[PDB]
């Protein structure tokens with residue numbers, strides 16, 4: 001199954017440390033996030049919100065970037081990666097109506113997304129889910145997990161991304177910080 | 182709603198003229214195709230099959246290409262566009278694991294998909310839907326409609342595309358030919 005669901009409420013494998021409502025309407029603070037590999041139609045009881053998305057193909061990265069990533073990126077579920085952060089993102093209509101070279105140019109040529117992210121590996125593990133195509137309120141669910149040593153660096157990464165040309169098109173962002181139970 | 186559904190069976194706005202099972206396991210012949218702008222979980226009565234997909238953002242076209250397409254491409258549901266073809270396509274795992282430069286190059290540099298397709302506009306109208314990400318048996322639903330004067334041409338276009346480098350990656354294909362009721 002390529003589909004993943006995230007349920008904020010009173011049960012789950014993760015503990016909510018905090019939520020930062022960076023841009024746009026936020027998400028309700030909850031005790032725990034429950035993550036599931038499937039669609040969930042039946043909104044669980046005592047649960048405040050459901051996010052979902054699917055794993056998909058590569059949209060921007062070229063072969064050499066891929067090769068560079070594969071050489072250093074960590075797997076998910078390292079025993080040390082006890083912190084995680086879920087970050088929903090929505091981009092503007094003006095971004096989606098742009099052609100594929102335009103978007104590529106802003107993503108790497110101008111914003112150096114891949115080159116910048118590479119500096120935070122192998123400390124940081126990541127997964128990218130897509131959800132615009134499902135009619136969700138957000139366009140993406142981004143997932144990061146790392147050992148505590150790296151929390152500082154990760155915060156530094158967030159502030160860099162948010163200073164890029166790419167982030168000018170971002171109209172909605174929440175940080176959900178988590179601790180593995 | 183970005184989601185479109187296509188049900189083969191005994192009702193619908195389109196009459197099946199023929200089904201050609203070009204490559205891989207085919208689709209059961211039926212009398213009609215019903216086309217709905219939404220999901221359909223409730224498997225309609227006396228229906229052989231259901232295909233669905235969503236409209237999405239551009240994946241390969243650059244801005245100059247988009248401009249050429251917009252100059253000439255016809256709208257859907259022109260009075261004279263009484264013939265239609267629905268063509269589900271699946272591409273190979275080996276296609277999907279390639280990077281974004283690699284697929285772009287096979288699609289346009291080697292295959293000239295857009296340049297070739299542009300020679301058949303404005304006779305032919307088209308819609309493109311994605312569905313690998315929904316877990317369907319096909320990766321794409323393609324939709325073409327035109328007046329009969331253009332049938333021979335459309336047939337020429339199919340044979341050109343299938344000789345392309347792109348089409349070496351196609352592992353499943355069906356043409357459903359239709360007539361508007």
Ligand code: HEM
Nearest residue numbers: 057058059060061087089114117118120124126140142161
């Ligand atoms: C930690 C290191 C990071 C690396 C190595 C990295 C790498 C990448 C790469 C290569 C892609 C393109 C995937 C594709 O071609 O489909 C991507 C997409 C994305 N990344 Fe990152 N990333 C990192 C961190 C982050 C962070 C911190 C955020 C947001 C807070 C973020 C947000 C995104 C988004 C939204 C996309 C999808 C872009 C779109 O389709 O418009 N990434 N990431």
Ligand code: HEM
Nearest residue numbers: 238239240241242268270295298299301305307321323342
């Ligand atoms: C009639 C003129 C045609 C034009 C102008 C045309 C144009 C295009 C364009 C510009 C794209 C790229 C969309 C993007 O960047 O997201 C595309 C994708 C596609 N076209 Fe065509 N097309 C035509 C005919 C056909 C035909 C006859 C077929 C199949 C029998 C076909 C199959 C496809 C498929 C499968 C894709 C998606 C490829 C992918 O995302 O991997 N096209 N078409």
Ligand SMILES: [Cl-]
Nearest residue numbers: 126127128129
């Ligand atoms: Cl990823």
Ligand SMILES: [Cl-]
Nearest residue numbers: 307308309310
């Ligand atoms: Cl289209």
